[PDB]
Amino acid sequence: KPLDGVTLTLASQNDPFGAVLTKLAAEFKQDTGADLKVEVMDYGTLLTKTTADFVGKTKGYDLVTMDIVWAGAYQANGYSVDLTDWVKRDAAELDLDDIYPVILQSLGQYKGHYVAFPFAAYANVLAYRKDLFQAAGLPVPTTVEELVSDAKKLTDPSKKQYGFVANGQKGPAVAQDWMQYNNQMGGSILDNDGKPALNSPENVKSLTVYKQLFVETAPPGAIEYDWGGREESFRQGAAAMMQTWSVGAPGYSDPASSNVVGKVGITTAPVGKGVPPQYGVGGWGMAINADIDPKQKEAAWTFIKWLVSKKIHKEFNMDGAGSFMRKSQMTDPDLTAKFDFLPVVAKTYENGNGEYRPRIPEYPEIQDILGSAVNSVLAGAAEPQAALDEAQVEAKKLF
Numbered sequence: 001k002p003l004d005g006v007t008l009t010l011a012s013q014n015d016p017f018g019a020v021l022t023k024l025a026a027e028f029k030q031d032t033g034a035d036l037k038v039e040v041m042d043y044g045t046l047l048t049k050t051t052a053d054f055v056g057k058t059k060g061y062d063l064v065t066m067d068i069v070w071a072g073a074y075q076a077n078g079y080s081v082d083l084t085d086w087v088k089r090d091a092a093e094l095d096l097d098d099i100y101p102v103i104l105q106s107l108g109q110y111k112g113h114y115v116a117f118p119f120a121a122y123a124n125v126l127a128y129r130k131d132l133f134q135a136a137g138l139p140v141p142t143t144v145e146e147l148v149s150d151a152k153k154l155t156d157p158s159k160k161q162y163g164f165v166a167n168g169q170k171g172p173a174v175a176q177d178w179m180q181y182n183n184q185m186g187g188s189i190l191d192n193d194g195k196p197a198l199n200s201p202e203n204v205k206s207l208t209v210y211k212q213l214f215v216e217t218a219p220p221g222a223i224e225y226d227w228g229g230r231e232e233s234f235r236q237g238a239a240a241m242m243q244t245w246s247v248g249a250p251g252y253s254d255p256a257s258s259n260v261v262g263k264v265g266i267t268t269a270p271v272g273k274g275v276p277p278q279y280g281v282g283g284w285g286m287a288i289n290a291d292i293d294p295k296q297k298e299a300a301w302t303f304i305k306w307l308v309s310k311k312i313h314k315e316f317n318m319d320g321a322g323s324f325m326r327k328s329q330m331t332d333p334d335l336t337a338k339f340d341f342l343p344v345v346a347k348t349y350e351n352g353n354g355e356y357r358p359r360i361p362e363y364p365e366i367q368d369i370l371g372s373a374v375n376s377v378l379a380g381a382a383e384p385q386a387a388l389d390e391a392q393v394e395a396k397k398l399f
């Protein structure tokens with residue numbers, strides 16, 4: 001087989017695709033003879049360890065799962081192979097027309113160059129407990145104000161029942177969840193010239209309402225949750241509503257992992273007044289480390305093409321990757337039977353906003369700064385105005 005004797009080392013975010021990539025290693029070795037070693041890490045550790053590998057030119061990782069919001073940093077620093085030529089050369093293998101253009105562009109490209117190739121696309125959705133809403137006589141929320149109101153109505157500590165959950169963990173997790181909320185109210189963290197605007201009066205008001213919501217309606221231990229932690233909370237039955245990525249939805253219908261099978265609805269994220277549908281897109285691309293040997297680059301690209309092929313990518317998603325990205329997947333009889341929320345995913349990608357969160361080179365640093373600020377506010381250590389003022393000062397140093 002062509003890749004006999006080859007080892008590929010892949011650094012992966014600990015989203016559901018980390019375990020699925022680990023599982024698919026066997027089939028990849030059966031198909032190509034290559035040994036795929038997947039190292040799954042949490043978001044911060046992943047970013048730290050792979051950035052150090054790039055900077056040191058040490059060639060420890062051949063393949064890295066690159067977050068959409070890292071695309072500008074990857075392009076500016078040349079961390080990854082520019083895949084533009086190979087995408088064009090091998091397009092017929094990739095069935096590009098069957099990948100939504102917003103996904104190819106936003107998860108793969110920056111400034112017209114492929115720094116990665118999309119392998120896991122996420123739609124921003126509201127997950128809610130159908131049973132709890134029905135019992136309470138409440139309609140499906142469509143406005144962020146409904147979310148606040150319903151979250152309070154559905155909080156009753158006496159039954160260990162919380163109306164709402166979101167991330168509290170310092171850093172990217174807490175930052176991203178506040179950013180999502182702010183986006184749905186038409187807010188931003190950059191001004192119209194792309195410069196930091198973390199502490200605008202709108203954002204201070206937004207964070208003030210968000211803090212009140214978090215303190216009043218989320219499980220008390222939510223101050224420590226990252227994405228996986230709040231997904232687990234929701235699956236366990238603890239919270240009535242959660243704004244999340246579609247990646248979490250396979251888990252809700254898994255009886256081995258879920259106390260809410262049959263109980264969860266998936267809809268578009270609610271919006272503030274005057275705000276049009278936000279169809280937020282996120283996810284991860286697969287990058288090849290620019291430092292590795294030519295034969296390692298060739299093998300890594302062979303792996304990428306294998307993974308995104310219709311056959312394997314369907315298997316990937318039937319195994320729970322929650323990473324749907326192909327038009328063909330949205331009408332596929334098996335995928336639609338297993339995952340009845342794909343109409344919402346498809347509508348999101350058809351209208352997708354691949355700039356739902358910034359992808360500029362400064363963003364990963366902004367994200368960490370904002371994460372410290374929002375966590376200090378949710379923990380009761382700093383007030384919204386002072387915290388965002390401080391964050392703005394630090395963010396401006398990057399420009």
Ligand SMILES: OC[C@@H](O)[C@@H](O)[C@@H](O)CO
Nearest residue numbers: 015067068227282283284
């Ligand atoms: O599960 C968390 C998810 O991987 C992050 O929000 C990424 O930033 C999505 O692009």
